[PDB]
Amino acid sequence: IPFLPVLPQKPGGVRGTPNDAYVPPPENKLEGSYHWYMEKIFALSVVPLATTAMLTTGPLSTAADSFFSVMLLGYCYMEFNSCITDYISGRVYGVWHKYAMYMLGLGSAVSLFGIYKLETENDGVVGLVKSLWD
Amino acid sequence: THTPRLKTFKVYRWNPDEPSAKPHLQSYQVDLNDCGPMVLDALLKIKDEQDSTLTFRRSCREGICGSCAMNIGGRNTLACICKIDQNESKQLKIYPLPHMFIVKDLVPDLTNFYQQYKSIQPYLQRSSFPKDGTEVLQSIEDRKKLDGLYECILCACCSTSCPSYWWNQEQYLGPAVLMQAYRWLIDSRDQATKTRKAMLNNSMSLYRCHTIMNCTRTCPKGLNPGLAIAEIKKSLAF
Amino acid sequence: KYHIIDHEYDCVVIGAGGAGLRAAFGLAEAGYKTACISKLFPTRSHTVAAQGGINAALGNMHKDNWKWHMYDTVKGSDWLGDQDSIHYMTREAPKSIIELEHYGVPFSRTENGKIYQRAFGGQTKEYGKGAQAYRTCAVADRTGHALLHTLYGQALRHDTHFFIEYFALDLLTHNGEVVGVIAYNQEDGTIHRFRAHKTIIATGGYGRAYFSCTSAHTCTGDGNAMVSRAGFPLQDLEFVQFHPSGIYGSGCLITEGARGEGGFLVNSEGERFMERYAPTAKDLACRDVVSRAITMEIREGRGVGKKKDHMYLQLSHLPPEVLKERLPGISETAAIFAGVDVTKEPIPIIPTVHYNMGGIPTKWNGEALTIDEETGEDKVIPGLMACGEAACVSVHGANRLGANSLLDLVVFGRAVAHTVADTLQPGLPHKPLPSDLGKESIANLDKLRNANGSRSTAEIRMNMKQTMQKDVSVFRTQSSLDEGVRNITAVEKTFDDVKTTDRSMIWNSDLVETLELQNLLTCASQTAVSAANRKESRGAHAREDYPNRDDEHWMKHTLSWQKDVAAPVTLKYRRVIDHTLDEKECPSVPPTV
Amino acid sequence: EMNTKAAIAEEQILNKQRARRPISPHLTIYQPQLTWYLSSFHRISLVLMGLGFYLFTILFGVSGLLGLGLTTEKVSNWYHQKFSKITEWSIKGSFAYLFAIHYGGAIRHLIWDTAKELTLKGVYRTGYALIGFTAVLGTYLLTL
Ligand SMILES: Cc1cc2nc3c(=O)[nH]c(=O)nc-3n(C[C@H](O)[C@H](O)[C@H](O)COP(=O)(O)OP(=O)(O)OC[C@H]3O[C@@H](n4cnc5c(N)ncnc54)[C@H](O)[C@@H]3O)c2cc1C
Ligand code: SF4
Ligand code: F3S
Ligand code: FES
């Protein structure tokens, strides 16, 4: 990742001797086990509701499209989030792991308002993507 | 009588008393006729009758200690089970285990791997034993659950083929240590599992797995460290 | 030139096998500052390859009594074992197996819910006159592999400072007593100098002195030679056991469960070896009479093979689901080295060198021994103990019973840990010693490193391996044994013309494997010498020119002395003990046939 | 006290050599297998189609607060005049299969977190059906 600064790392990958155990981080199940639940919820929802987006002829109703447009935002949020903690990690970048988690804040909170101008003024997000073509 | 056939091995090399050099590949021609049917039988003939600066690990030549695991011809496998194809027109490339800080030639530094095996506490943690001093009891259908878990030899041909362990190997435990955290969960005589299922419940120790299973594909003992992770996840939620 | 780094412990242990690990957390469970020095990682040893069982008189498949287990151990040695160590190792055997299940060894269970015991070879109940017994207490085909990975996880519970990948060079001796070791950090290239109070040697056996063995690659005799370079003796080195089932060419091993539950040693003509050339009445006997049964059959010509030095063994009569549940690991080691599966056709077999029933002479409580050179009595070496395969308690004597060497490690590793706790107090200052302590081994490491001669260090090893397979073999006489003593002195004398082409100091795998040749010539010169001075035939030492056992002139062990490579060898003898620990608990057996 | 100066005098001569070791190569030698070639097309296929979902909605979001008045039929007719005729199909042909290898790839993954078909015979027989499903669904979306 160019143009970032890097924290000073461990000399060689390890510090100590093979009888010095690795002390695990404390139990933080809002980032652990609960995050596995908010990943399967948005995956069990955008699979059936996209199958009732090819088997419909016109547009969807605004009720059945607003529930489909929030779940597509939470699905793409939980995959851009795990590409942050996998690549721009915190041992090697430090404070820029938390700044690049804030660009998924006010760069995704204005996407929720951008749906609100597509569900009331215009018609949906499946009405947009069909309108272009394909 | 015996017209000599010549295969060409291409072994990775480094020498840490001149670290200014770059690691390269060196070519050795091995007469395939007076040589054994495995690769370790061909890497020991090079050390006897040619350049003996080559270093590697080996102990039993049977496949049960896990000490000569390398990257032979594209995949991680054990060098005393991997068989030379008797076709002397193609070459062979032998590399160390991928993405490890190597030591001299084909010896990786597995020090971080022995500090992560220590931290899943691989010992029994009961609190009481029967009164006439005999053994603890365990039926056959509970003993059946361990088959395929206790017979891992700790070679790290599964851990060093997993793209999440290639990058986050300082905080992700790998598929070799997460299977042995599961051999002590499903033991029917291990009555402290509220603590074994609590050091895995952080951001990146168990959940840096994406089910891209190179592990079950390249284990040379035929086990399944990819299914044994997806039962911990099914248990930490349910 | 060299970095000397000093340490200061209470009991250092050399070797982290099955027997060095058991005596390294019995020591740290009492308040001692134990340290375990190993060359391999502790789960890469040779006791990872054991695949039989551990004999114990539990009796959860029939009635059993340990007094009968004592009789088969002493009969199976042809009365050369110390009969007070047989009383100790067999009494504390049910306790030291039930204890091994509370550490978490995944023992194969039965329909009752207890530990499953198969039937091995050599043990019969009711004092040698009765039915076959079922005492082996087994995991499926991985009893050795599940015994290391549990004892190593248990020695992570307590504090025990492992020094992994150190090569121990010599014992630090001073005024006739030992005080510690001097090792060599293989990863880095520094010289470490440990100092202890009770150093404990549990290195292992020498097997690589022969051409075709079933040992590992690291089973050079490294603790038998460190002792003999200090001036102390080694006991009973000529008794070498020959396993009757080893794969042709490579030397890999198939278990004795392949004949413990159904097995036919099948000739070239297709019969079972029961009578009329080589065999006794009951089959699957001790390995002494069944290996000399084979080498005369292929000598007469009744042996199947391309060159006809080769045999068969079928595994087709069994049901294919008992070849899967009870013996699964053998089925892969016969399909990749032989290329023939174990369900339709027989497999190739030759006899090869297996186990070594000699080493440092020991009491039953772990302490090493020597003799006082005037009265010839026993005399303990102050500060040195030994346990495992590299120690001759003579609980095996002349022929090790099958599946009895994994009980040797748990029982006599537990005993070594207890007898230090009764004698040494925890916390005691060390005597000050001079600054060049251990200066003879730095001068010997330096000489082998800057070597330049004519013969390479893998060529002298081939002259030694081809000599002791030819002469010191299963059938030996005093006209070819004398040719071996002349040859193994010639190979010893050309070690001062060796050639090493690696002057590096970080992971020198040419300086380690030329120190494993110096250790394997001291162990191998006293094997051909100590067998040319035994004019009898008992156990696994059979002479062609003296075919009867002399109970009145050869009921004695043999001790041997040799200081350096290419030095004269002297021999002296000591009396074998013939009384138990308690004359009312068990009576000692008389020497019969 | 000794043993404390021994784990300091050895570390400083160990950390001097430990910082000059190389890294053995990991990509560009590993074997092309089906297991990390199909689950590296599942991580790509949500980055590219995920940027096209973000970027087409901030444009409707930053023109919501700031008065711009962007409608669906305004930005659609802006799109068609912009790119060339062979370009209007090449984006349309790339994004057709990238949906089908992810719609077929989300169905596959939800079986795997119930620990079914996680053998080695099941990963390959529900990984060849992923290649059939892409070539018959993604081709059907090009005709429409
Ligand atoms: C093929 C085979 C099959 C067997 N099967 C059975 C069986 O079925 N049943 C049975 O009861 N017995 C069996 N045995 C016998 C028994 O398993 C072994 O002989 C015994 O376990 C050896 O254990 P040990 O502690 O004596 O030595 P090892 O376990 O060999 O200990 C060796 C260790 O010592 C250390 N070491 C060695 N040299 C040095 C050095 N120079 N410096 C520092 N450290 C050093 C290293 O850590 C090495 O790992 C078998 C043996 C073999 C060879
Ligand atoms: S799971 Fe397989 S590849 Fe991984 S360490 Fe164990 S035996 Fe080796
Ligand atoms: S390859 Fe790695 S991501 Fe999981 S399925 Fe195996 S540990
Ligand atoms: S030497 Fe034991 S695994 Fe190859």
Chain A contact present for D1, CB below 8 A: no
d(CA B82, CA B95): 14
Distances (CA, A) of B58 to B8, B61, B107, C209, C495: 22, 7, 11, 18, 25
Using an 8 Å Cβ cutoff, are C341 and C316 in contact? no
Contacts of B221 (CB under 8 A, 6+ apart): B63, B151, B152, B153
Chain D residues near residue A50 by CB distance under 8 angstroms: 103
- Amino acid at the residue A36: W
Nearest Cβ partner of A21 from B119, B200, B207?
A: B119
Using an 8 Å Cβ cutoff, are C179 and C172 in contact? yes
C438 is in an annotated binding site: no
Q: For chain B, positions 56-115, list CB contacts with chain D under 8 A.
A: 71, 74-75, 93, 95-103, 108-109
Phi, psi for residue B165 in degrees, rounded to 5: -80, -5
Chain A contact present for D92, CB below 8 A: yes
Residue D2 belongs to a domain: no
Tell me, using a 6 A CB cutoff, whether residue B65 lines ligand 2: no
Q: DSSP characters for chain D? A: -TTTSHHHHTHHHHHHHHTT--B---TTTS---SHHHHSSSTTTTTTHHHHHHHHHHHTTTHHHHTT----HHHHHHHHHHHS-HHHHHHHHHHHHHHHHHHHHHHHHHHHHTTT-S-SHHHHHHTTSHHHHHHHHHTTHHHH-
Phi, psi for residue C312 in degrees, rounded to 5: -130, 165
d(CA C313, CA C317): 11
The experimental method, as deposited, was cryo-EM
Contact C103 B123 (CB under 8 A): yes
Least CA distance to B111: which residue of chain D? D18
Contacts of D118 (CB under 8 A, 6+ apart): B213, B216, B224, B226, B227, B230, D112
Q: In chain B, after which residues does the backbone break, taking C–N over 2.5 angstroms as a break?
A: none
Using an 8 Å Cβ cutoff, are D108 and D130 in contact? yes
Using an 8 Å Cβ cutoff, are A84 and A101 in contact? yes
Question: How wide is the angle at C-alpha C336 spanned by C-alphas C284 and C144, nearest 5°?
Answer: 55
User: Is C328 buried (19+), middle (13-18) or exposed (0-12) by CB count in 10 A?
Assistant: middle
Bridge partners of C499, per DSSP, are C456
User: Is D10 buried (19+), middle (13-18) or exposed (0-12) by CB count in 10 A?
Assistant: middle
d(CA C511, CA C41): 20
Using an 8 Å Cβ cutoff, are C534 and C573 in contact? no
Residue D21 belongs to a domain: no
Residue D6 belongs to a domain: no
Total number of domains constituting chain D: 1
CB atoms under 10 Å from CB of C50, counted, come to: 22
What domains appear along chain B, each with residue ranges and CATH number?
6-95 (3.10.20.30), 110-238 (1.10.1060.10)
- Using N-to-C axis directions, what is the helix angle for C439-449 and C512-529, rounded to 10°? 110
Using an 8 Å Cβ cutoff, are B2 and B33 in contact? yes
CATH-assigned architecture of domain C255-348: Alpha-Beta Complex (3.90)
- Amino acid at the residue C347: I
In terms of DSSP H, where are the helices of A41-81? 43-46, 48-51, 62-80
d(CA C8, CA C73): 41
Question: How wide is the angle at C-alpha D25 spanned by C-alphas D22 and D30, nearest 5°?
Answer: 165
Start-end of CATH 1.20.58.100 domains in chain C: 439-549
Contact C9 D13 (CB under 8 A): no
User: Number of C-alpha atoms within 13 angstroms, CB side, residue B71?
Assistant: 26
Could you please state the CATH topology (level 3) that the domain comprising C439-549 is classified under: Methane Monooxygenase Hydroxylase; Chain G, domain 1 (1.20.58)
Tell me, using a 6 A CB cutoff, whether residue C45 lines ligand 1: yes
- Amino acid at the residue C557: H
Name the residue among D63, D59, D96 with its Cα closest to residue D79: D59
Question: How wide is the angle at C-alpha C138 spanned by C-alphas C132 and C142, nearest 5°?
Answer: 135
- Picking from C45, C54, C101, C255 by the largest number of B CB atoms within 10 A of its own CB, the best residue to mutate is C101
- Amino acid at the residue D18: R
Q: DSSP characters for B64-117? A: SS---EEEETTEEEETTT-B--S-TTS-EEEE-SSSSBB-SSS-B--HHHHHHH
| Domain CATH for D105 | 1.20.1300.10
| Domain CATH for A83 | 1.20.1300.10
Contacts of B170 (CB under 8 A, 6+ apart): A10, A13, A91, B112
d(CA C231, CA C237): 16
| Domain of residue D115, residue span | 31-143
Which residue reads 């080893």 in tokens? C246
Using an 8 Å Cβ cutoff, are D37 and C526 in contact? no
Give long-range contacts, CB 8 A cutoff, 24+ apart: D116-120: D118/B213, D118/B216, D118/B224, D118/B226, D118/B227, D118/B230, D119/B216, D119/B224, D119/B227, D120/B216, D120/B217, D120/B224
CB atoms under 10 Å from CB of D26, counted, come to: 18
Residue D12 belongs to a domain: no
Residue with CA closest to ligand 3 atom 7: B175
Report residue B46 as tokens. Answer: 């090079």
Contacts of A25 (CB under 8 A, 6+ apart): B202, B203, B205
Phi, psi for residue D46 in degrees, rounded to 5: -105, -15
- Amino acid at the residue C312: Y
Least CA distance to C339: which residue of chain B? B37
Q: Please report which ligand is nearest the Cα atom of B78.
A: 4
Using an 8 Å Cβ cutoff, are C291 and C242 in contact? yes
d(CA C154, CA C138): 20
Bridge partners of C185, per DSSP, are C166
d(CA D106, CA D142): 21
Name the residue among C139, C208, C256, C570 with its Cα closest to residue C356: C208
Start-end of CATH 3.90.700.10 domains in chain C: 255-348
| Domain of residue A101, residue span | 33-132
DSSP state of B138: -
Tell me, using a 6 A CB cutoff, whether residue B153 lines ligand 2: yes
- Picking from B113, B173, B195, B202 by the largest number of A CB atoms within 10 A of its own CB, the best residue to mutate is B202
Q: In chain A, after which residues does the backbone break, taking C–N over 2.5 angstroms as a break?
A: none
Residue D58 belongs to a domain: yes
Using an 8 Å Cβ cutoff, are C189 and C166 in contact? no
d(CA B226, CA B214): 8
H or E element, residue C224: helix C224-228
Total number of domains constituting chain A: 1
Using an 8 Å Cβ cutoff, are B44 and B127 in contact? no
Distance from Cα B227 to the centre of ligand 2, integer Å: 13
Which residue reads 């520094």 in tokens? C190
d(CA C194, CA C225): 19
Distances (CA, A) of A22 to A15, B70, B155, B160, C198: 10, 26, 19, 19, 32
H or E element, residue C172: strand C170-174
